[PDB]
Design a protein around this ligand. Structure first.
Ligand SMILES: Cc1cc2nc3c(=O)[nH]c(=O)nc-3n(C[C@H](O)[C@H](O)[C@H](O)COP(=O)(O)O)c2cc1C
Ligand SMILES: Cc1cc2nc3c(=O)[nH]c(=O)nc-3n(C[C@H](O)[C@H](O)[C@H](O)COP(=O)(O)O)c2cc1C
Lengths: 117, 117
């Protein structure tokens, strides 16, 4: 069950995760294999968790709060945020987030794509 | 966002709904257009509701309880149950339900297919 199949025909992204905002702490319910391999985590380490663990020692905490407010807004947004892989290595992530809507316009999931730049 | 894209390549079903068991009353979060058209409901009338409203005056209540227990079991099952469209017309539904799993084997959704027989 590849939830990337819910994204548009135009969009083709490797590292993608899907979260469920109706569950406590907005946990990830699906991650692509590219997400796992690029970060170095196993499924057991990430499923059911909020994606904020990609942050680390030099991440700007206001960038973190920006993402939280953007999610509350249920809109498309992109932000350059310093992130980290399981092994501690750092990268600038051009993080792209978009709400995924049901056919009636209700929020179903958030999709978020990781893009090292 | 067509959640039927999460089903297997081998399966091709028209009327399909997806429910979220982590939400109160296991509501439907996605219904195919075929489900809406065959039952005669609009999106507003079904999204966010448990699918038990396809039952009606002559439905066997033990068949209903069978489905509830089958869902608790998180397994594939099929049952012939008397169901009803929005206009009150009755049909025998060969209802097919299967759990939809995340890559780690955790339950994500239930998928249920309606098949008038
Ligand atoms: C689908 C999705 C993907 C996300 N991906 C990332 C990510 O790649 N990197 C990151 O730093 N935060 C990411 N976040 C943001 C965190 O999950 C979290 O919302 C953020 O840190 C703000 O909330 P907090 O202050 O409670 O941590 C993502 C959020 C969602 C919903
Ligand atoms: C994905 C899904 C599809 C379902 N489709 C039907 C259906 O087509 N007809 C039906 O009578 N019940 C259907 N059900 C069963 C009802 O939602 C409900 O679980 C059942 O009536 C037993 O629970 P209750 O005793 O609380 O009503 C479906 C359940 C799920 C999770």
């Amino acid at each position: 069950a590849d939830l990337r199949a819910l994204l548009d025909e135009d969009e083709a992204e490797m590292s993608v995760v899907f979260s469920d905002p109706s569950q406590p702490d907005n946990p990830m319910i699906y991650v692509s294999d590219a997400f796992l391999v690029q970060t170095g985590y196993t499924l057991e380490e990430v499923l059911g968790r909020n994606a904020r663990f990609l942050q680390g020692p030099d991440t700007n905490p206001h960038a973190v709060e920006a993402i939280r407010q953007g999610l509350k807004a249920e809109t498309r947004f992109t932000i350059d945020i310093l992130n980290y892989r399981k092994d501690g290595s750092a990268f600038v992530n051009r993080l792209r987030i978009r709400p995924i809507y049901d056919p009636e316009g209700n929020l179903m999931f958030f999709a978020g794509a990781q893009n090292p730049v």
